Amino acid sequence: ATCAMYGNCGKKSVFGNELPCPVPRSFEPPVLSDETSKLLVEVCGEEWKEVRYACCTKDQVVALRDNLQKAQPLISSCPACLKNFNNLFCHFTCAADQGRFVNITKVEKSKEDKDIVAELDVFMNSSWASEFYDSCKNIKFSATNGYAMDLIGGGAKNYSQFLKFLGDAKPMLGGSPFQINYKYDLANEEKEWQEFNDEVYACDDAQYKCACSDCQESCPHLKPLKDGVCKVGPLPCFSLSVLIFYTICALFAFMWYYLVFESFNNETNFFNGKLANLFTKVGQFSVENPYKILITTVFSIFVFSFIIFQYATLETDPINLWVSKNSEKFKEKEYFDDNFGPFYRTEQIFVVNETGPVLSYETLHWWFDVENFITEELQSSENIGYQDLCFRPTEDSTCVIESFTQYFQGALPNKDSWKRELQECGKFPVNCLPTFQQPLKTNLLFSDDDILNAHAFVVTLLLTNHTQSANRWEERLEEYLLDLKVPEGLRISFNTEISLEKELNNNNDISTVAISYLMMFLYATWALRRKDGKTRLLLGISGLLIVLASIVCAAGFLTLFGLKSTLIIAEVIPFLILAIGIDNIFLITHEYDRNCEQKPEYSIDQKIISAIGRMSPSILMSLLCQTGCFLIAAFVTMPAVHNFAIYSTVSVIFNGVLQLTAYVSILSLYEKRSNYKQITSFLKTFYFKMLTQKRLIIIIFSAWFFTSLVFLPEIQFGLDQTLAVPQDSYLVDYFKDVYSFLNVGPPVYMVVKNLDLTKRQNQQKICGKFTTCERDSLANVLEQERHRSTITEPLANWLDDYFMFLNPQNDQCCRLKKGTDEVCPPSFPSRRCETCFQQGSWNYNMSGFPEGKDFMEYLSIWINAPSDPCPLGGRAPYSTALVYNETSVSASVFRTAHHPLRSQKDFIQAYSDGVRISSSFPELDMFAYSPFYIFFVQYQTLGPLTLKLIGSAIILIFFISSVFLQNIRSSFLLALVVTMIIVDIGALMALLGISLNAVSLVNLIICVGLGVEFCVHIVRSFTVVPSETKKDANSRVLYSLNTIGESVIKGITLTKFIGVCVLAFAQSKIFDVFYFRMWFTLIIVAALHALLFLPALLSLF
Ligand SMILES: CCCCCCCCCCCCCCCCCCCC(=O)O[C@H](COC(=O)CCCCCCCCCCCCCC)COP(=O)(O)OCCN
Ligand SMILES: CC(C)[C@@H](C)/C=C\[C@@H](C)[C@H]1CC[C@H]2C3=CC=C4C[C@@H](O)CC[C@]4(C)[C@H]3CC[C@]12C
Ligand SMILES: CC(C)[C@@H](C)/C=C\[C@@H](C)[C@H]1CC[C@H]2C3=CC=C4C[C@@H](O)CC[C@]4(C)[C@H]3CC[C@]12C
Ligand SMILES: *[C@@H]1O[C@H](CO)[C@@H](O[C@@H]2O[C@H](CO)[C@@H](O)[C@H](O)[C@H]2NC(C)=O)[C@H](O)[C@H]1NC(C)=O
Ligand SMILES: *[C@@H]1O[C@H](CO)[C@@H](O[C@@H]2O[C@H](CO)[C@@H](O)[C@H](O)[C@H]2NC(C)=O)[C@H](O)[C@H]1NC(C)=O
Ligand SMILES: *[C@@H]1O[C@H](CO)[C@@H](O[C@@H]2O[C@H](CO)[C@@H](O)[C@H](O)[C@H]2NC(C)=O)[C@H](O)[C@H]1NC(C)=O
Ligand SMILES: *[C@@H]1O[C@H](CO)[C@@H](O[C@@H]2O[C@H](CO)[C@@H](O)[C@H](O)[C@H]2NC(C)=O)[C@H](O)[C@H]1NC(C)=O
């Protein structure tokens, strides 16, 4: 055939490889000999079997073979890439029709006085080259963790750049002895020179499959798109749905513009009758025996009061009061703790120079003198320094101190060039390895990657000691940083492990609790003052003592069962019971007071029973409504607020019993002792005149409800940390510092359980660096989630490292004494030990990889490798990432990490990313564990839950009210207004700035309970009226507001207003945001609906 190159004619110059000898195209080389053909087929491939007029010689082919092994090990990972290299070079020399696409631009005279090619030109197009570049575009150099394109192609980004390096003449570097140029353009209208072409193989090519890490095409691009989770259009989807609903409703209204209860009442009527008889029975006993009942109450308080002091008055800690012990995210933590040890105990310290760079020699000199002090010679009260508690990657290794000081091995740098040294270490961490041999990324050590201009740098200390000794040192560290003096202009914010626990139980704001009672006491006397003008001080005091006695009795009774109340939640209860407890006091006394001027025939004792009997149903409903709502709220599994419901349910039942059996007896004596003479409009006539505009009132409020109904989807989620801890604390500074001066997120450990990892089938679902690994393997899937999910850090796959550790290429990694299975000790420097796997036994397609028993035999060697000579030694990094018993690997951990997570919207989102991915592997028995997952487990289903609980409460009210009221058309109206209030509160919940948590969920669940109190009294009076009042609706509602309106304004509304008004002045910001705003807004809204909407609504019921 036409050969443009055949044979060699000596070296161009001294110490130079022999160059090819140019020959004319017409010249016909001799047919390939048997000896030559044998080498060509094996070196290049089977395609050269049939070639006859090959343009190569024995010395020419071997020369190419010698140089191929220079690069073959560097691209052997991708079989497709390897094939292309061989074909390009093999056809570049031995192609039969070489002259078709090969031209010799220039020639030179060799030392042997023989012409030798100096410049070579080859004709192709940008199709073979373009595909060839694509195949090796993404190949990764595992050893350096960088692209092999950097070395082989000089980091070429385009095919021209890559092939330019290949065609460059670098004989000294082993490159092409003579310059080679590529001619992509080839017109050849005369059909003289034909273009270069052959069979290309991409990474995805089935025959020559390639791993995902070496090419994206073979990687699981089949990612099911996830979307439609936020909204549609510029507004929430729900809002649009409701808005269109109104429009269609208006159209129906526009179209129309042109134009048994009594059967069951028999049992229900008798049901209330039996209720009155029983209640009247209690009244007579409690009034006729004001000593046997009063005395036992005092004694009962002592028994419960003593129990609190003696048996238990304890509290809890964050993990025991914000995460349920039955949730999956907690049962998974216990598994992780038992096997892979509890997570470390961080001590992050931030050094901040807001408004300027922080890194200066005086600052660096100052810090180095205190970082060493903390981690070397601090010592707790028991003399246990950091070195006795630090985290050591192995038996012997310097303590892990993730700080920028470790770049200099902990020694002060010289002032002459300290700036330059740090920049180089930060840019290339591997060079400046710390004392414990672990590179420190600049993101984990500075606020940004510029370092020099960084505003703050982080200093993380890790403790692997989980005994009480570690707690004492942390207390010493906290007391050492608070009293530490910093240079002018800086600022230190830190957080030990015990800081949060110590700071939640530190806002002893009990002072405000006393004031609220005292403020309520002042009002209580005024509210209960005799209509004549006399003030009954004893009744007001007796009312408060009953409330306090209920809490004391409730705590004692529940202390026996072992419940513990947190300090933060133990301060709300006094406010809550005061708000609701005193509410019944005014009614019972007010009804008796009304009976003072009427029915004068009855004596003091007789009148009392009448008041109790008359109000028996109204009060009882306020109890069943104030007890069912709390019990409903107990369905929240967070122990801090689950105990809040239970501690409040018993603090109202006991109060209810006390107010019916104890307080009445006090009234039996105080009134009897007084024996007052028989007791015989402004700002009121104006009322009931504004209510004449019934139709207008409904329109305004109905518009308010519908408007508030579209803003619900804007309610935020999450409980901010800075609220929980007291203000003016050292944790609020830290939390504001993590959200701004941190660049590394929490780690996530993708635990895997009950996997053989000794069978080729199972090993293929984890590996992600070998061609035959399953596409949907763990390493492969997580690789793609990096660009789509919150888990965006490289996976520390131990299995991949274990296999590569056996690579015969790395002779220093796996070594065995010849003829024996004993691992060759590192001391032996001679060639008395061979690699564990022979050259022909280790292939990238996992051909002869360890299997069955062999897998565990070599796992012991890898896990115990020194790691010093071979960087892939797994002892240091994966010492505690495996759980094995020399027969199988019980469990393993693949570490990853999220991105900084600069808010509570990221914390919730990050949690679902760890739960979604862990559910994408139906075969693997896997779960993802990050330290913060347990705390954010409620937000996964808080949306559906807050509708079931609040929705279930409203249905409950419609049922108990229906029985007690006996009038369905009235109970439904009551439920329609309570649900109206909640939706309005839900909208204002978003506007004000409150979030939806377990704390806010229970507050909103008990809002219906409070909301029913305002409205139930009006409905009850309206439903049942004296014969004198007209049976028409308009007069009946007017009558009710004139008989019970006064009590509602004073007893029901103003009482709660004073109870919660003082709660605004609270040291802890959690009380103000969640307990005050929610309850203060409820009173305003409920006081409007109950007193302006419910009257108007009932008029035209
Ligand atoms: C006669 C007695 C029996 C009557 C029948 C039962 C009545 C039950 C009424 C329940 C009222 C619930 C009020 C909840 C207020 C707080 C809501 C907080 C936010 C919330 O639930 O989630 C957002 C919106 O939810 C949503 O889906 C928003 C819609 C919530 C319901 C809207 C009001 C329902 C009707 C009220 C009147 C009933 C009259 C009864 C006479 C989520 O937002 P996202 O979708 O972006 O988040 C997707 C991720 N989770
Ligand atoms: C510096 C090296 C390590 C970089 C470039 C990577 C791979 C090297 C080994 C590759 C890249 C291009 C290759 C190359 C270019 C061209 C020729 C001319 C041909 O007639 C014989 C093979 C030969 C001589 C090979 C030898 C191996 C080379 C030089
Ligand atoms: C009912 C009260 C006692 C609750 C709301 C107050 C505080 C505790 C129980 C809870 C509420 C929110 C929790 C919380 C919020 C967010 C974070 C950030 C995360 O990276 C670590 C856990 C951490 C730091 C935890 C710690 C425990 C907290 C602060
Ligand atoms: C914090 O950063 C500033 C910014 O350079 C350091 O220097 C100050 O720079 C501002 C702005 O030029 C000047 O107004 C101050 O007078 C500088 N103060 C100095 C030089 O002490 C500052 O030193 C840094 N704080 C430290 C190192 O503690
Ligand atoms: C955590 O640190 C403590 C304190 O050093 C260790 O407790 C010591 O254990 C040794 C056992 O040889 C005793 O001799 C000491 O008296 C203990 N000291 C104290 C203060 O109790 C504990 O062993 C460490 N735990 C771990 C898991 O390393
Ligand atoms: C993985 O690749 C190796 C290497 O090719 C295969 O083992 C044999 O390799 C020799 C030399 O290349 C071939 O002549 C043999 O034909 C190969 N064996 C077979 C069965 O073809 C090994 O087979 C490959 N394994 C898989 C699963 O493809
Ligand atoms: C080593 O530990 C593993 C734990 O992963 C044991 O796993 C066995 O797994 C099989 C298959 O699921 C079960 O039928 C066995 O009951 C498991 N063993 C036990 C003890 O539960 C494995 O058996 C252990 N082997 C040795 C020699 O201890």
What's the SSE blueprint?
Layout: E1 8-11, E2 18-20, H1 34-43, H2 58-75, H3 79-94, E3 102-109, E4 115-123, H4 128-135, E5 140-141, E6 146-147, H5 149-152, H6 159-167, E7 179-183, H7 237-258, H8 261-288, H9 292-310, H10 328-340, E8 345-346, E9 349-352, H11 361-376, E10 401-402, H12 418-427, E11 456-463, H13 468-482, E12 491-494, H14 499-504, H15 511-527, H16 537-560, H17 567-581, H18 583-597, H19 604-614, H20 616-633, H21 639-661, H22 663-674, H23 694-709, H24 721-724, H25 730-741, E13 747-753, H26 760-763, H27 778-785, H28 798-805, E14 816-817, E15 833-834, H29 853-863, E16 882-884, E17 889-897, H30 904-918, E18 925-929, H31 942-965, H32 968-992, H33 998-1023, H34 1033-1043, H35 1045-1061, H36 1069-1099
Parallel strand pairs: 4-7
Antiparallel strand pairs: 1-2, 3-4, 5-6, 8-11, 9-11, 9-12, 10-11, 13-17, 13-18, 14-15, 16-17
Helix pairs in contact: 1-2, 2-3, 4-6, 8-19, 8-22, 9-16, 15-16, 15-17, 15-35, 16-17, 16-21, 16-22, 17-21, 17-35, 18-19, 18-35, 20-21, 20-31, 20-33, 23-32, 23-36, 31-32, 31-33, 32-33, 32-36, 33-34, 33-35, 33-36, 35-36
Phosphatidylethanolamine is lined by residues 236, 238, 709, 712-713, 715, 943, 946-947, 950-951, 954-955, 958, 972, 975-976, 979, 982-983, 986, 996.
